[PDB]
Amino acid sequence: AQEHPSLILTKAGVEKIRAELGNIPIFDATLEKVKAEVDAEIALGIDTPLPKDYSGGYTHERHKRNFFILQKAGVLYQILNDEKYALYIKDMLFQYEGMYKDLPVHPQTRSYARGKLFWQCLNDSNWLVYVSQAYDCVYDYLSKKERKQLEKNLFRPFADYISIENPQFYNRVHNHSTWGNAAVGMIGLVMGDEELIQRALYGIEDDGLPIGAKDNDGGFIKVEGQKAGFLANIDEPFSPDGYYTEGPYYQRYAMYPFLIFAEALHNVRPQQKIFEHKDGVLLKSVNTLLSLSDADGEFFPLNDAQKGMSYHSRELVTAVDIAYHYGNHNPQLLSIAEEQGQVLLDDSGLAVALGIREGKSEDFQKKSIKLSDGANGDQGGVAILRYGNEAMTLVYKYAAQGLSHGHYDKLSFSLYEKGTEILQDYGLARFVNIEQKGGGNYLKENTTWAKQTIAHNTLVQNETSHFEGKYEVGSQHHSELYFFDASNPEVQVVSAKEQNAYPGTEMHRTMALIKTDGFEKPFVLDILRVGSNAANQYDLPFYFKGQVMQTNFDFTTPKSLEPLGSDNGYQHLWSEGLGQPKGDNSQLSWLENGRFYTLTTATNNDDELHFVRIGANDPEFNLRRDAGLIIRRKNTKNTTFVSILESHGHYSPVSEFSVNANSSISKIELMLDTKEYTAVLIDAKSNTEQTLLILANENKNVNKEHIIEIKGKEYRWTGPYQFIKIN
Amino acid sequence: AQEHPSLILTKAGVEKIRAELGNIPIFDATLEKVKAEVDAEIALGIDTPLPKDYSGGYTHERHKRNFFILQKAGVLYQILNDEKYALYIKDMLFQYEGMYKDLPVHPQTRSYARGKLFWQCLNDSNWLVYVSQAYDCVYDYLSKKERKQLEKNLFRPFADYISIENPQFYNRVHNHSTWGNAAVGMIGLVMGDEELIQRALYGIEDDGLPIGAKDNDGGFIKVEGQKAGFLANIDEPFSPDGYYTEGPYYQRYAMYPFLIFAEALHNVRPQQKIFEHKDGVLLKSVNTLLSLSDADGEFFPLNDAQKGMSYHSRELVTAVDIAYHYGNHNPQLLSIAEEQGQVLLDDSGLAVALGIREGKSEDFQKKSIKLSDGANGDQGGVAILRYGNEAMTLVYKYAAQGLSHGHYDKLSFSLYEKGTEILQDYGLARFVNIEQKGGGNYLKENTTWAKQTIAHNTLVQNETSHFEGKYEVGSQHHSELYFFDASNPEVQVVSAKEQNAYPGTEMHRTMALIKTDGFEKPFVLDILRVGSNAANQYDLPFYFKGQVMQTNFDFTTPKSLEPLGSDNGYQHLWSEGLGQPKGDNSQLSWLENGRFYTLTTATNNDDELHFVRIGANDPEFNLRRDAGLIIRRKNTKNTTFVSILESHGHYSPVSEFSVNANSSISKIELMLDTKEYTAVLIDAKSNTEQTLLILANENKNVNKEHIIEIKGKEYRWTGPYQFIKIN
Numbered sequence A, B: 001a002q003e004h005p006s007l008i009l010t011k012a013g014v015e016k017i018r019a020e021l022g023n024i025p026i027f028d029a030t031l032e033k034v035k036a037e038v039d040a041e042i043a044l045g046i047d048t049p050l051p052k053d054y055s056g057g058y059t060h061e062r063h064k065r066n067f068f069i070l071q072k073a074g075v076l077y078q079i080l081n082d083e084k085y086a087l088y089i090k091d092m093l094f095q096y097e098g099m100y101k102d103l104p105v106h107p108q109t110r111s112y113a114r115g116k117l118f119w120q121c122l123n124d125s126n127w128l129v130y131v132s133q134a135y136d137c138v139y140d141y142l143s144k145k146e147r148k149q150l151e152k153n154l155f156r157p158f159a160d161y162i163s164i165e166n167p168q169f170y171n172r173v174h175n176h177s178t179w180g181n182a183a184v185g186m187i188g189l190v191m192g193d194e195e196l197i198q199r200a201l202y203g204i205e206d207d208g209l210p211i212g213a214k215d216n217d218g219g220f221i222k223v224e225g226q227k228a229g230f231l232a233n234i235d236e237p238f239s240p241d242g243y244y245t246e247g248p249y250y251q252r253y254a255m256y257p258f259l260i261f262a263e264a265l266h267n268v269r270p271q272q273k274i275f276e277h278k279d280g281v282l283l284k285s286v287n288t289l290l291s292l293s294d295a296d297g298e299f300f301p302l303n304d305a306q307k308g309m310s311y312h313s314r315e316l317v318t319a320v321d322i323a324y325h326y327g328n329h330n331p332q333l334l335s336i337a338e339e340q341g342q343v344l345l346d347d348s349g350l351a352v353a354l355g356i357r358e359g360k361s362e363d364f365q366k367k368s369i370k371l372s373d374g375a376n377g378d379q380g381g382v383a384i385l386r387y388g389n390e391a392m393t394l395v396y397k398y399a400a401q402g403l404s405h406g407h408y409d410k411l412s413f414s415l416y417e418k419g420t421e422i423l424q425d426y427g428l429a430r431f432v433n434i435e436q437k438g439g440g441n442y443l444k445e446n447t448t449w450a451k452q453t454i455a456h457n458t459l460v461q462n463e464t465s466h467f468e469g470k471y472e473v474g475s476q477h478h479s480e481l482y483f484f485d486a487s488n489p490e491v492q493v494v495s496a497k498e499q500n501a502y503p504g505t506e507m508h509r510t511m512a513l514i515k516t517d518g519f520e521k522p523f524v525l526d527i528l529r530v531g532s533n534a535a536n537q538y539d540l541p542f543y544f545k546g547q548v549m550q551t552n553f554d555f556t557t558p559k560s561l562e563p564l565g566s567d568n569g570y571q572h573l574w575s576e577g578l579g580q581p582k583g584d585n586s587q588l589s590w591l592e593n594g595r596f597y598t599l600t601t602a603t604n605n606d607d608e609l610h611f612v613r614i615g616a617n618d619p620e621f622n623l624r625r626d627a628g629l630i631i632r633r634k635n636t637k638n639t640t641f642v643s644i645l646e647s648h649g650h651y652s653p654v655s656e657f658s659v660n661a662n663s664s665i666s667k668i669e670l671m672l673d674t675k676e677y678t679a680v681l682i683d684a685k686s687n688t689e690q691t692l693l694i695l696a697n698e699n700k701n702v703n704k705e706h707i708i709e710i711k712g713k714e715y716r717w718t719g720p721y722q723f724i725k726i727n
């Protein structure tokens, strides 16, 4: 009964594509490129080496390229009606059949679930997701006899290897299991095997896995009460806003198996209603992921994340095209496709190409957005505040743990200007798929530096990470949204609280992106209110990007670089300079990508200002030599940090003109600093430009009227904040 | 009798321009932009503040902007026939006339020749060069009475201030004097003042200046027996190849007054034959300067040079347009104009716009080139070796001292790939015109770091700079070309010697850019042959750009960073790691801008390999935290360093594919290491690819036959080198 192909590329799709070839430029260009890639590999032959290497090494790269080429050859066979591509697929599949059944477990031992073709079952699963698509395309070209042998001695044993033989890999809520479930489900759908389809959807019953079983990034295999299978992987790690809890770098990775297996289920098993599952979260999550990119389309490096990953990736070409075709045909997705400059060679890519040709493209709007975390949207979140035409972007992370890849980074932020990183989230310590750096795998310093709180722009207490850097503790906690109000494009405000990172301490951080008279550009206002039951040492880092220009405080320069501390990331920071404040406001300015920036922060006489540089205890040169300024406030119980980050002026080494190189801040002052209310007065240097932000800290209700006095003058407003011009 | 304007913009030119407006896009676009700029400044008014500041500060930037705006207003008045612009010029000139005569010497005391409007006479001279052009454009609009007052009480006193009152600035062979001579000459030409015209052409007679006196950059004010004036500044600091001895960054700066005053002389005094002077060197020098830029048009940072200065600068818009119009109408210059995207608003810019419109543009060929230094071309030189379509670029500097801005780095080199710096020349320590960095002026670390030999990719002996870093010694010496042969695009070789940098030591450095079977790309071969009369410590730095990927040697990582040494630049290097070689070849690889690089060097077992980081003894953060690898060879008399720099493969954080990340070098071996002959065998990993470079070291004659034995085998060739495939 079942047609082949039908999962991704459909029979009707092949006919529609063939009818339009030559009149769909983005598709035609992709077809030419892919045909040339596959033809070159056909010329080189068929290589299925005995597996040996980690990522970047020959056997890994060869088996990886093979799965990409097989899927490409499958669609070429169908679209071009050229059996040279079917013959290549047949010959490669049979060469695999000749070796796979006799392979040992992969000789590399790092993985908690060692693969056969690859060092880990994740990559064997990648292979089967792609190869299942190729098999769907050549199914009718093969004889019944050929299909029987491939299914019996290659595909069914492979599907069992990555599932029932490795339930620790397969049966989780984790990107690994999403790939595993998709691999088993895709091949099950092609073969019409109900057992495998059910195993894909609902996982393995009674897996026998014990308590506290972990993998290699610090994460539990199983979580009490959680289901397994594809549907569990949709329900648990996505919020109702389509935010994937591992963060955008890993959301990017998981989007491929999520949307490909969803597409396959939609086409073969429409009764599953997979695109309606969890209030249509998979389709929504594509928009959400695109919103988590900077002006150049590069995903914000939250949690474990390599900088440079972007919506130009193959996963986002796939996700955009599937979301366009199977969703509500959102014309904003077509502008992303135009930027990508390629489409999938299937029904969905054709739909995108036709939408573009018909003049339907609309610009993808990059907006201020509140995203919830947790399956029910009640476990913190992530906020993005954007000014104007994506002119300045603040990312505030008040999220849940994020599973294994999560960082100890409650209430951290990062700042960008038109695709230039200004205040960074470090990302991972890993050179992804570069064999020369620890086999392309996570490095020691991912744990010892990149995950630690001191590596982030957030509060560190007593040189200890949030939750003492203990995964099992952090996994039980999330920061809490206090309020989000981005309605005023000139004054956008978000506020969140964290009281479990350091038991006995309450952190309440409010961030605002504010455009006001006296300043060339919007600035960031950062209020970090700290309450505690004991005198502590508080560190507040700012990991700036660029060349130091000026300070308004003196600092000493040591004759030798010593580490800042001994543990929890401090062992990776060199102490490059130590400043003492000259007064109530301390300022650091720098130049980055032709623009000046100034950090102004409210300082006390006994504060220390630490210039630091990353790179201590880094024997393999695994860390970047980036700099930071850390405010250290010793022997302090309750305190409120108040900072402004300005962007101003410009420099060019062509014109050699320096323009507006100084700050426009005259003064920032806490006018009220209580548990119930915080008030910050901001004075610009030009003319009578004064503004006041007042925060109500213990009642978020939008209709609650507040009455306070500052210097014998009454201020009245409704809701959790007011920003007023002081005349 | 004399028409006005006539120096730069001519009356015939105004008519020709007016006739073509609307049909010359590059010109029309420039006119629109400049009109908007000037109209905005007219709206803001006329501000001539009491001078106070250094560069980047208000009074400097305001008086600087004024001279640019006055020249722009002059050409707008003429082109648009709109007295709005003439009135602005008149009013600003008279506001200047009201204040200039009563000014004190500029209150800042740094300059050896303090200005009146600016901290230095150089900038007062900039002002007069530009304002003379504006005066030429409004000369007939003003009354005789107005002109008489401006000439008597503004222009003539100004011209004397920057010349006869400051002969130490005016009467040199120096970019300062080129600007000063042009300033006096330009105003002299507008006024028809023969005395000033003669003072511009031939300098001050009997200047009385001290010989051996130094400027504030460490170089001599006046050279014994040397002429002064504009013609001397053409003859002396340019070689017969059009290479300006101060280096490309300063050549760029001087190109404006050279070509502007030459144009004025050509138009007003054609009998001078200024464009024929020194065998037409000024026109040639424009091509030479363009050839001294990387693939993005950025000038190589040789000697004092800020990175990022490029042929998009105003000086190169000017130089290109004048060279096109008054030279042989070289169509290659039109492609540079198209890249610049603007032209001068005058006869020369019209000529360029019309050439572009008529389809005459041809691409500017970026070639391998040998450039001599010294007035007669016999004081060393600079060699640029380029592979393919500007695919890899090696810059080898065997030059003379370079006057005050020259660095102590005989035989240094730098390496670029398609506009990406791979091995750097540091450039200057100065943030040009940024007030926050020492008033935008040369920093202490320009002398203590940037000029020193240890900052360069060349030999350092006993932790001492070339010539002991003494100008009075270095200025008397230059390296000597041995041979240059770039005729074979696959195998380009240059060789030079230096025996005075370290008296008693002979340095003979041969560099080659070689494409051969077994390697993806051309590589650089570096042979640094050293002969001495004593056992020395030799350091050879490689200041690489990028992220360290792998080494084939172990190295220790200290718990504290200590400076590498105490003096001569070593005080600015942190010792980050110390390796000992594992064998005869040591290797370091890195990743920069998506490409891998490997340095392989021939090591002895007692060598030290030092990982260093710039930034010690840098209390103001004036230096970049760039890294290097230094080969240290102690207690050694004669030795020959042999290194290869490979470019291979690629990485993308979008695809996450690492390709060809390992070196293709199997072995490099010194097969013969004598004073008379050097032979280096290169083995690629592909076992059948072996090559041999043989150098004859004591006879450069191209027809001299050589017969030598290596491992019992005779080799015969003619000329100073042979590169042969070993079968």
Ligand SMILES: [Ca+2]
Pocket: A301, A302, A303, A304, A407, A409, A425, A426, A427, A450, A451, A456
């Ligand atoms: Ca992080």
Ligand SMILES: [Ca+2]
Pocket: B293, B294, B295, B296, B390, B392, B393, B416, B417, B418, B419, B420
């Ligand atoms: Ca280049």
Ligand SMILES: [Ca+2]
Pocket: B301, B302, B303, B304, B407, B409, B425, B426, B427, B450, B451, B456
């Ligand atoms: Ca230099």
Ligand SMILES: [Mg+2]
Pocket: A173, A174, A175, A176, A178, A233, A237, A254
């Ligand atoms: Mg998942």
Ligand SMILES: [Mg+2]
Pocket: A294, A295, A296, A390, A392, A393, A416, A417, A418, A419, A420
């Ligand atoms: Mg951005």
Ligand SMILES: [Mg+2]
Pocket: B051, B052, B053, B054, B059, B060, B063, B117, B118, B119
């Ligand atoms: Mg001034």
Ligand SMILES: [Mg+2]
Pocket: B110, B111, B112, B113, B120, B216, B217
């Ligand atoms: Mg000076």
